Design an enzyme around this catalytic site. Structure first.
Site, short mmCIF file in Angstrom:
data_model
loop_
_atom_site.label_atom_id
_atom_site.label_comp_id
_atom_site.label_asym_id
_atom_site.label_seq_id
_atom_site.Cartn_x
_atom_site.Cartn_y
_atom_site.Cartn_z
N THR A 246 81.14 39.02 53.62
CA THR A 246 80.04 38.63 54.47
C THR A 246 79.86 39.84 55.29
O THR A 246 80.41 41.09 55.40
CB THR A 246 80.50 37.55 55.48
OG1 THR A 246 80.95 36.52 54.90
CG2 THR A 246 79.34 37.16 56.08
N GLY A 247 78.34 39.84 55.93
CA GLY A 247 78.30 41.11 56.91
C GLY A 247 78.45 42.44 56.06
O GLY A 247 78.89 43.25 56.86
N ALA A 248 78.21 42.45 55.14
CA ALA A 248 78.49 43.95 54.30
C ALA A 248 77.46 44.86 54.68
O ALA A 248 77.72 46.12 54.41
CB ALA A 248 78.25 43.70 52.80
N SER B 262 76.55 46.27 57.34
CA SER B 262 77.04 46.94 58.42
C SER B 262 78.23 47.68 58.32
O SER B 262 78.68 47.65 57.15
CB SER B 262 77.14 46.13 60.07
OG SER B 262 75.73 45.97 60.58
N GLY B 263 79.13 48.23 59.30
CA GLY B 263 79.90 49.26 59.01
C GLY B 263 81.26 48.78 58.10
O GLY B 263 81.56 49.01 57.06
N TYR C 244 82.95 35.14 72.42
CA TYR C 244 83.28 36.08 71.40
C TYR C 244 84.80 36.10 71.10
O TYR C 244 85.23 35.91 70.15
CB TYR C 244 82.90 37.46 71.49
CG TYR C 244 83.58 38.43 70.44
CD1 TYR C 244 82.85 38.50 68.91
CD2 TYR C 244 84.36 39.27 71.04
CE1 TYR C 244 83.56 39.21 68.18
CE2 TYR C 244 84.86 39.88 69.91
CZ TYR C 244 84.54 40.10 68.70
OH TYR C 244 85.23 41.13 67.60
#
Ligand SMILES: NC(=O)C1=CN([C@@H]2O[C@H](COP(=O)(O)OP(=O)(O)OC[C@H]3O[C@@H](n4cnc5c(N)ncnc54)[C@H](OP(=O)(O)O)[C@@H]3O)[C@@H](O)[C@H]2O)C=CC1
Ligand SMILES: NC(=O)C1=CN([C@@H]2O[C@H](COP(=O)(O)OP(=O)(O)OC[C@H]3O[C@@H](n4cnc5c(N)ncnc54)[C@H](OP(=O)(O)O)[C@@H]3O)[C@@H](O)[C@H]2O)C=CC1
Ligand SMILES: NC(=O)C1=CN([C@@H]2O[C@H](COP(=O)(O)OP(=O)(O)OC[C@H]3O[C@@H](n4cnc5c(N)ncnc54)[C@H](OP(=O)(O)O)[C@@H]3O)[C@@H](O)[C@H]2O)C=CC1
Ligand SMILES: NC(=O)C1=CN([C@@H]2O[C@H](COP(=O)(O)OP(=O)(O)OC[C@H]3O[C@@H](n4cnc5c(N)ncnc54)[C@H](OP(=O)(O)O)[C@@H]3O)[C@@H](O)[C@H]2O)C=CC1
Ligand code: PMR
Ligand code: PMR
Ligand code: PMR
Ligand code: PMR
Lengths: 316, 316, 316, 316
Positions: free
Chosen positions: C9-11, C13-14, C191
């Protein structure tokens, strides 16, 4: 003639307390005071000196549909005829930055003023039809500021129902705006929009049921009753300054007793039998048919409001 | 076993909200939240995350007998069995120089705490008897300060019911004193007297109906729940200082969840089937039978209270 | 051995871009980059120079359950085995006075971080079980600030899940609070609560499925990657000051490449086959089992979270 | 019903002399006065005017196990049934710098108060079981100062049984401490520890034999009997000042006759048939179940005491 039964909302405070006093000092009416606070309703009834026999307080919290259905089932359990229903309840939040919402998620001003009254009226209409009383009426209160024809309507914040975009959304305020138009939340605009919704509701009721049944539908603007509790949430400086401002500078101040006698006249005057009228009173205690604004009179918009509200409350 | 029905008063605020949460997360109970504010009761139920199926808010304003009889007629109209009745409602006015009175004229602390609960319990007892549930209980909340054995009871203002002189007068406050003893009005003494009246009511119910029916009667002191709204009318400095004072100096602080789980244990524990017990909890979550004060245990005084209250509410 | 398939997931970004780079330069993995922005995911893949054959971008917006189910149906339509699932997506809103909510009404931080990953993992677990790969793992990212044992956890705003009061409410924010505890909305606490929920999710998955299937479950804290976009919504002064502060004063700064190589080691190291471990790395690139906080390890609370989340997403 | 037989210890002095007087003036009991001084026991029996037929003095020195076994063999030689056993003996040494020890080496306060009674009760229990009397009871006296819940327990010197370190040692005082906790010798702490041991003994007897046999076990606190000889070893100034101090300032003074009638009520009241109760009396001669301290109620500690005492006396 049988003493007639009048279900009056929000009787605890000024307008409904005065109306009940007027309709009970005659001795020709049985008043049912439907109010959120049962204790506040007893102290008012005693203070105003209404006869014990004439009044019969019952609970009704408009913000909760469950309360409405409960009130309806109890009222049908009393096995009493219903003749006249008056919708005069309202809550006003002038100075709120963050909005407060009702039990089903709707913004508090629009649920109390319109949706709850909309459900109660439609449910009790069946009881109204099966009543042998000579005159059956359904009274819905309104405000002049809802109409934009007058200077009161043209104050810097004013009413708008552009697309009923918020009502279709469901007014939950989630991924949407609580305001019907969709604009930034304003305390006054919601109340004015609810008043407009009430006027459209009266029009639609006249169109759909006047011929079928024979139940007179009416709306009225009493005047600027600056002594009531609607401005309780406002700042003190306003509460103090406003009444003289109306009395002397705008000359629209009306005494509470006058407003009560006017509404009671609407309730019980034989002459005022024309349905679908936005009544109003003159300086000389003269009743006239005032004229609504363009948007308020729109047929399609009122139809759109009727269907949306009907779906939201679960009548469908 | 059938999900049992529990009518819990004052569920909107801390103690009853917690009790409902505890008895609804199990999934073995249908809770009926009898509260004066219908909207305040929905926001609490949603916030506490009780299942929609389990709760069913209904109106009940203890200060008005009419509200009680209405609630009773509606509850009998639902055609549902009644198993457990919990009386936990209370209003406290520490800093009142002039007293506020209820609808029938009684001082507000004594009508809400004792008289209304007294009428509701006696009316609903008939429903309790005709219930096929295995365990039927009637829970009445009490306070340790009502008893004078403990240091909490021996604070400078303390409880007294010397001759039930005020109750016989009718508590109207006209040509008489609102206080039961007849002394100068004190905000705290009235509440403590009402708690004592509740304890005597439990004793008398045990004596008169325990053998005849088999309905367990109980009273309990949870602890000093300093986070609730009972001290809302008190000054802010008290509200702030009191919780730490109990936590560290007197070490009587109990969390809200603990109080709810304790009351629910009283409601549903098989072991706690002995009637006429002033329950209490230990530091280690241990339930014990605490001992009442001399006056609280007086038979004649409780009989005198029973007859007077029965006459006042119109049961006669 | 077959090139194994890794859904990350969320590849864009960093952290996920680095993990994909590390797992694709080897040539032994087929990476599936599940990201909300398809265009942002192509520019990153090209920039980082991952081989064309190895990557295969697919859409997944965690905030929308419909997107998750769509991704799942497409992924099952590709008729490809699933071996390792990595949950590393997150959105952080430090400086929000008014909260933003996801499509089903949940507060945005808790839906993206926990609920969406919770649904995706449970749906894809069936695919994981029917995979002939030697090692199957499910990686869930976490943060040290979620635990309160360390100084990072004891910053003035810290995490709390006292009663899961908000989760039971449904996090809609209507007649309730978006925060799980029920307190005033804070950008950071949400969060941190979501990170705690993820840790509890790992524990519960280990307890319920480790013996049945043989799917390793793990969580890890890489370090303070101050160069990523998680702090995009923060003020510029923070973004500038924080990286040196970590590099020199707290000495917790880790390079992006190191974090990627660490996570990839977790993915593909034979030694790290113990399930239910909150992994962590030492200054000398040494992997150790760090210890969670008391609340994070609570069994009952995790069970309570599991059932509530399962009901909310419609798995029931 | 057969005149029942009551073995009462320490009848020579106040409490047991009063109990014997009360149980012999009725004419329904045969009392056996087990006392260390045979001559002191005759002068008391004559002085108190107990009937010659009803009493039958026999020797028993608790500090010597040989005396206990001798008493037991003689009592079984009389071929008489045993119904009720009362343990009320005690020796108190407030102002001892060097301790005095019993025959088997144990500190004198703990052997007389607990160990001897422990052996006598267990030996005579077999006789109690084989008795056709309707009600069989075993009465063990206790003191409020043993419990630390009350102010009397919280005096500067207070009771403690931290590890039963001294009891395991054997209380010889050689290469060890006579005190059970292991602290410096204090005259009062030993007596209080023995009272606690007696309470734990009652609890354990209830747990181990109540269901098997049907022998009621009870303990009671009569009050502060300041007129007795327990304070004989104290200084005169105390003896003089203490009784008024209790009468007026603490208001815990009870007359000797009241204490005797209370204990006799425990012995012969049908209502008080609940076992394992630390009885107590109210100001109005009301019997209630008082609550023990946390440590006194510890199960493991009582088990540890039971096994140690059983080994020490040679029962093993
Ligand atoms: N300047 C003015 O005041 C004007 C008045 N009007 C009309 O006057 C009408 C009455 O409001 P008004 O008397 O002036 O001021 P009030 O608000 O003091 O009267 C409002 C009444 O509504 C009742 N009410 C509020 N919420 C609920 C609820 N959820 N369920 C049941 N009852 C409820 C209140 O009960 P409670 O007593 O506990 O508050 C009160 O009795 C309004 O509908 C308004 O349109 C029209 C034009 C201007
Ligand atoms: N320190 C403490 O708090 C202690 C608590 N207790 C007991 O706790 C019990 C609960 O009071 P508590 O929860 O602590 O504080 P609260 O007053 O906040 O709870 C009181 C409840 O009574 C309800 N109530 C008040 N008046 C009425 C009415 N006329 N009709 C129906 N319901 C009414 C209130 O409704 P609403 O929510 O709208 O106010 C509220 O839900 C009391 O009976 C008290 O004896 C005992 C010892 C000490
Ligand atoms: N200091 C730190 O950075 C620390 C990092 N971590 C962990 O690092 C992990 C990665 O966050 P990080 O790389 O640091 O910073 P980023 O937010 O820049 O990376 C977050 C990734 O999540 C993706 N994402 C966000 N929302 C969605 C969505 N609705 N659907 C699909 N993908 C989404 C983003 O896509 P897009 O690129 O379009 O934003 C982005 O690729 C976090 O889970 C955090 O717990 C742990 C401790 C501290
Ligand atoms: N303030 C108080 O007095 C209180 C009393 N109690 C209880 O009262 C009980 C009785 O003590 P109390 O009457 O008050 O004062 P006493 O000491 O004067 O009575 C004690 C009795 O124990 C007898 N006795 C002492 N040693 C032995 C022995 N080795 N063998 C056989 N008998 C022995 C004594 O015989 P002899 O006559 O020769 O001394 C005496 O008859 C105590 O167990 C105490 O727990 C409880 C709370 C407080
Ligand atoms: C000159 C005629 C007139 C009349 C009859 C009213 C009644 C009126 N005075 Mg409005 N008002 C008039 C005009 C004005 N006063 C004005 C202001 C004003 C305010 C701030 C408010 C108000 C209000 C009204 C209302 C009462 C509606 C209410 O109670 O909600 C009417 C009937 C009331 C309202 O609009 O709130 C929703 C309120 O808050 N008027 C202004 C600007 C100075 C003008 C010139
Ligand atoms: C040391 C024990 C103890 C306990 C358990 C309570 C509980 C208690 N804290 Mg009282 N209280 C104790 C003692 C004291 N605090 C004291 C004071 C005090 C006040 C001012 C008040 C109070 C109260 C109580 C009450 C709560 C009853 C209430 O909510 O009405 C109990 C159970 C409450 C009350 O009496 O009002 C009617 C309240 O207003 N306590 C005093 C004087 C400093 C003492 C030493
Ligand atoms: C001394 C050790 C240490 C470590 C390893 C971190 C990592 C950490 N730096 Mg926290 N932090 C530490 C401590 C401190 N820096 C602090 C402050 C701080 C802030 C303001 C923030 C932060 C954060 C963190 C986080 C990153 C989590 C994130 O990206 O959401 C960790 C791992 C980050 C966060 O908590 O937001 C939700 C953020 O906004 N730290 C403070 C107060 C000066 C202390 C002493
Ligand atoms: C206020 C209640 C109370 C009661 C009922 C007793 C009974 C009591 N008076 Mg303790 N005592 C109370 C309290 C106090 N007097 C106290 C003192 C005190 C002493 C010095 C003594 C004593 C004792 C007791 C005892 C008698 C136990 C005995 O006979 O061994 C109880 C029941 C007795 C004892 O503890 O010795 C082992 C003894 O020597 N009390 C103190 C300090 C001034 C306080 C305030």
């Amino acid at each position: 003639l049988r003493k007639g039964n009048v279900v009056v909302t929000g009787a605890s405070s000024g307008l409904g307390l005065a109306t009940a006093k007027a309709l009970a000092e005659t001795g020709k009416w049985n008043v049912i005071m439907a109010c959120r606070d049962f204790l506040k309703a007893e102290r008012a009834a005693k203070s105003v000196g209404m006869p014990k026999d004439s009044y019969t307080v019952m609970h009704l919290d408009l913000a909760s549909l469950d309360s409405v259905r409960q009130f309806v089932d109890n009222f049908r359990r009393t096995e009493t005829p219903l003749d006249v229903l008056v919708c005069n309840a309202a809550v006003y939040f002038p100075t709120a930055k963050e909005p407060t919402y009702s039990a089903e998620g709707f913004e508090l001003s629009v649920a109390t003023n319109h949706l709850g009254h909309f459900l109660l009226a439609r449910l009790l209409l069946d009881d109204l039809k099966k009543s042998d009383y000579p005159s059956k009426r359904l009274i819905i209160v309104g405000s002049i500021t809802g109409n934009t024809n007058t200077l009161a309507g043209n104050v810097p914040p004013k009413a708008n129902l552009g697309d009923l975009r918020g009502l279709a959304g469901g007014l939950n305020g989630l991924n949407s705006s609580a305001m019907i138009d969709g604009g930034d939340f304003d305390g006054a605009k919601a109340y004015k929009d609810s008043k407009v919704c009430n006027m459209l509701t009266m029009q639609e009721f006249h169109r759909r049921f006047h011929e079928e049944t024979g139940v007179t539908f009416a709306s009225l603007y009493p005047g600027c009753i600056a002594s009531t509790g609607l401005f309780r949430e406002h700042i003190p400086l306003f509460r103090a300054l406003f009444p003289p401002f109306q009395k002397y500078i705008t000359k629209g101040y009306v005494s509470e007793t006058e407003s009560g006698k006017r509404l009671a006249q609407v309730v019980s005057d034989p002459s005022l039998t024309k349905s679908g009228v936005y009544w109003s009173w003159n300086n000389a205690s003269a009743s006239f048919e005032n004229q609504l604004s363009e948007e308020a009179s729109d047929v399609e918009k009122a139809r759109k409001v009727w269907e949306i509200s009907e779906k939201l409350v679960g009548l469908a």
